[PDB]
């Protein structure tokens, strides 16, 4: 069980950790989150009381270092930082617990939600999408744009997701124009799985990381990227059985976790109707289809 201490809480902010969140009042004595389960990535995110715009946040893995939050009054935000002084860090942490100024990561033992949402997400891959290699953790916010968005301005702040484009040379072999556009198995399995992602787990990892960024920060291009990756699978006739079964599990827990009040912007009607009802894999997402119908039959 790991700890992420906070130096102070100078401004009224709603703090989130994973799918949990807490309201913290201006100069409320809040000093960290304890009992964070080792073994998964995590994300700690923020939404100031005054600016309900720009949600922001840090992906991290506690095995990679000791991290803490400190409000910066110049830049006006809660910053994640690393303490290299291991001794000095257990000291801050043990004394904040003694004073009991820290919330417990509130995990129900029956609950596999966070695991299910992060099963394939690996900190090493997050840092390739969010290049900032002097930090071991990764900042994302509501407004950051993706590499594909930028092609149609600042690349230092980009989400370097894998670019998927159904009407590109990459996607379409010469002489197989009609075949490859109606059946994306080539693009999926040769170009993306074997070529770029190397295996299905890195594929699902990005898929999952994109969903989580859409959900936690309303990052619009992450949403676009999650839909793309779902659609490419669902629009391929030939997909390993193990991928189809895992995908049904992945989408299930993502649909399950989405705030009900947000289904309108975060869920692309065209993609979901195509995947669940028209695509080659209509019959392969039984749990994702049952849960979608019982929760968002309007969208369909």
């Amino acid at each position: 069980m790991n700890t992420v201490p906070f130096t102070s809480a100078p401004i009224e902010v709603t703090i989130g950790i994973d799918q949990y969140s807490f309201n913290v009042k201006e100069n409320q004595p809040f000093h960290g989150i304890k009992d964070i389960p080792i073994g998964h990535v995590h994300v700690i995110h923020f939404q100031h009381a005054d600016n309900s715009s720009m949600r922001y946040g840090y992906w991290f893995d506690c095995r990679m270092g000791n991290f803490y939050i400190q409000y910066d009054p110049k830049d006006g935000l809660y910053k994640m930082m690393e303490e290299r002084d291991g001794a000095k860090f257990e000291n801050i942490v043990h004394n904040f617990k003694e004073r009991q100024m820290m919330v417990s990561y509130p995990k129900i033992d029956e609950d596999d939600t966070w695991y299910n949402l992060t099963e394939f997400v690996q900190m090493d891959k997050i840092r390739k999408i969010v290049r900032k290699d002097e930090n071991q953790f990764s900042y994302v916010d509501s407004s950051m744009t993706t590499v594909q968005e930028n092609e149609l301005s600042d690349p230092a702040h980009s989400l370097n997701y894998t670019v998927i484009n159904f009407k590109s040379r990459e996607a379409i072999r010469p002489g197989h124009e009609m075949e490859d556009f109606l059946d994306k198995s080539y693009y999926l399995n040769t170009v993306m799985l074997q070529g770029i992602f190397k295996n299905s787990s890195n594929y699902f990892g990005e898929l999952q990381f994109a969903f989580l960024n859409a959900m936690f920060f309303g990052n619009y291009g992450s949403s676009l990227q999650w839909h793309a990756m779902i659609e490419l699978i669902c629009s391929s006739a030939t997909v390993p059985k193990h991928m189809l079964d895992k995908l049904d599990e992945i989408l299930y827990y993502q649909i399950k976790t989405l705030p009900e009040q947000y289904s309108d912007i975060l869920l692309n009607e065209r993609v979901w109707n195509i995947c669940l009802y028209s695509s080659f894999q209509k019959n392969s997402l039984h749990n994702t289809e049952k849960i979608m119908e019982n929760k968002y039959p309007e969208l369909l």
């Binding site: 009407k167 040379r169 379409i172 124009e177 009609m178």
Partner: protein, 237 residues
């Protein structure tokens, strides 16, 4: 973007552009089988590719053999259209390739777009106009060459004959579409109108009668009256 009445004169500027119409690409007769079931028989079709400024028509004949052993032929027809258009573009010298291709049916955008990925600076556009290019097989000379073909074949026509010697592209296109519109609403009358006078002939190298300027006015007025009449009959106005 989409082509409509607002930007209509753009068709006559000096940017090379082509219309593509696929309505006569996949043509069937529907008949009954011995057991009483319905079956189709395909006949030859054509892609109607036309430069509206110059009158040049690239009539690509689609031989029934193309369909042999294929499923989802109506879907396949859009892709075959787009294959053949793309090959036409490629066969053209660079300075002859169109800057734009305007498809008369939106369902052609994705096939052509995919087939054209090698020409990213050729813009593929839909249109809102309700153009009558489907009646292209009502022009006796085009329908004849299509129905006689025994292999895939490309045939070059100027669809304006020699009009541009005497009238603009704008006016030449408005005549063409008026002619075809009438041929489409009522072919029998439309064709009656064009041939009634045996003394006005079609040159061997032309599609339409060699009307004088004054006769074209009477023809265009006769075609306009035809179209308006058929409208009241359709809708009871």
């Amino acid at each position: 973007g989409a082509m409509n009445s607002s930007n209509y004169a753009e068709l006559f500027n000096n940017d090379i552009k082509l219309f593509v119409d696929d309505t006569n690409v996949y043509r069937v007769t529907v008949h009954k089988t011995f057991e009483g079931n319905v079956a189709t028989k395909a006949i030859n079709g054509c892609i109607f590719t036309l430069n509206p400024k110059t009158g040049h028509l690239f009539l690509k004949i689609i031989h029934t053999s193309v369909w042999a052993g294929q499923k989802r032929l109506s879907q396949l027809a859009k892709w075959k259209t787009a294959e053949e258009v793309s090959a036409l573009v490629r066969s053209l010298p660079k300075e002859e390739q169109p800057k734009q291709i305007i498809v008369t049916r939106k369902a052609m955008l994705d096939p052509l777009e995919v087939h054209m990925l090698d020409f990213p600076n050729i813009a593929i556009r839909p249109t809102e106009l309700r153009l009558p290019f489907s009646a292209a097989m009502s022009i006796d000379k085009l329908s004849d060459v299509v129905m006689k073909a025994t292999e895939p074949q490309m045939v070059l026509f100027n669809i304006y004959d020699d009009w541009l010697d005497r009238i603009s592209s704008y006016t030449a296109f408005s005549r063409l579409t008026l002619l075809l519109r009438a041929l489409k609403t009522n072919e029998e009358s439309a064709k009656m109108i064009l041939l009634s006078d045996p003394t006005i002939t079609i040159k061997s190298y032309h599609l339409w009668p060699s009307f004088t300027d004054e006769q074209w006015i009477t023809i265009e007025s006769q075609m306009r009256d035809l179209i308006l009449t058929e409208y009241g009959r359709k809708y009871n106005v």
